[PDB]
Amino acid sequence: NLPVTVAGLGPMGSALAAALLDRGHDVTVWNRSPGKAAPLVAKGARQADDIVDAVSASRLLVVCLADYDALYSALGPAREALRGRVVVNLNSGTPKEANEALRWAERHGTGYLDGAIMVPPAMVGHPGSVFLYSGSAEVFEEYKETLAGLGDPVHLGTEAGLAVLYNTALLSMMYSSMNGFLHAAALVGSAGVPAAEFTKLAVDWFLPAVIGQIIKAEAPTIYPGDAGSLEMNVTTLKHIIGTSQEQGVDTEIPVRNKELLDRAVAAGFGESSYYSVIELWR
């Protein structure tokens, strides 16, 4: 039961469709290029002829396409068939793109959720999958159970752009953290330290016990316990850069991190908090 249509059958859209099939939904699939539907049809999906049939088959339409232009092109022809259905858009962009899609959906009498997929395709549907959602709370509550088949659905608020905002923010932190980890791994690696054991120490202990706790301790709105003054952290970074040079590891990462603190010291004091670094960017 709970018929669902998936539009877009790239690697992510295919995973969405397959996860929905595995929970036993009546899944209708649609894609622009041919040949992406066959593997899903084999697994029990009905392929729709035209986008109107696809949209008409289900009250819930899960969209996973390249951008907003792609969404309009794909779903534009559906016209009055969208009226009274719900679009769950899993591929915005930026928050302005999310708001543009909300506008498009509302013009067509269509409910709208914007979602960010927080795991790779292969994790979709499996324990650990988490999807962030923004949009009408009524709509979210009505389709929550269906959405749960893809991953733990977290509703951030009713404004269209929030999911993309949170997703882009979290991912920005992820890239920096991963790059720092790779500097770390290069550093120990240059002494011949085996990576597996260091990785486990860094991820299973240091990341939650030290990095997480220090972040919360620096957050002025939230361990006894903080990162210490800017000036003491500058000195720490000078030792990291020194160590990196000794070991023959590129100093780019700690050099940039030190320059950032130097800027924050100059704007405030050597005694200002670590968190005040954020004032350089807003």
Ligand X SMILES: NC(=O)c1ccc[n+]([C@@H]2O[C@H](COP(=O)([O-])OP(=O)(O)OC[C@H]3O[C@@H](n4cnc5c(N)ncnc54)[C@H](OP(=O)(O)O)[C@@H]3O)[C@@H](O)[C@H]2O)c1
Ligand Y SMILES: C[C@H]1NCCc2ccccc21
Q: Which residues are annotated as a binding site?
A: 9-10, 12-13, 31-33, 36, 66, 91, 216-217, 219, 222, 248, 282
- Based on the shown chain and the rule CB under 6 A, indicate whether residue 242 belongs to the binding site for ligand Y: no
Q: How far apart are CA 27 and CA 2, in angstroms?
A: 9
SS3 content of the chain, % helix, strand, coil (to 5): 55, 10, 30
Contact partner, 43, from ligand X, a copy of itself, ligand Y, none, Cβ < 5-8 Å per class:
none
Per CB under 6 A, contacts with ligand X among 11-40 are 11-13, 31-33, 36
Q: Are 97 and 68 in contact (CB under 8 A)?
A: yes
Side chain identity at 76, as an amino acid letter?
G
Q: How far is the CB of 240 from ligand Y (least distance, A)?
A: 10
In this structure, how many other beta carbons lie within 10 angstroms of the beta carbon of residue 123? Answer: 16
- Based on the shown chain and the rule CB under 8 A, indicate whether residue 127 belongs to the binding site for a copy of itself: no
In a 3-state reduction of DSSP, which class is residue 4?
Answer: strand
Per CB under 6 A, contacts with ligand X among 91-130 are 91
Per CB under 6 A, contacts with ligand Y among 1-40 are none
- Based on the shown chain and the rule CB under 6 A, indicate whether residue 158 belongs to the binding site for ligand Y: no
- Based on the shown chain and the rule CB under 8 A, indicate whether residue 255 belongs to the binding site for a copy of itself: no
Q: How far apart are CA 191 and CA 188, in angstroms?
A: 6
Name the nearest CA neighbour of 260 among 250, 272, 248, 249.
272
User: Which of 177, 266, 267, 271 contacts a copy of itself by CB under 8 A?
Assistant: 177
The tokens for 239 are 């030792």
Q: Are 41 and 57 in contact (CB under 8 A)?
A: no
- Based on the shown chain and the rule CB under 6 A, indicate whether residue 210 belongs to the binding site for ligand Y: yes
Q: How far is the CB of 69 from a copy of itself (least distance, A)?
A: 13
Q: How far is the CB of 51 from ligand X (least distance, A)?
A: 9
Dihedrals phi, psi of 255, to nearest 5 degrees: -65, -50
Query: Which residues of the chain form contacts with ligand Y (CB under 6 A)?
Result: 118-119, 210, 214, 227-228, 233, 236
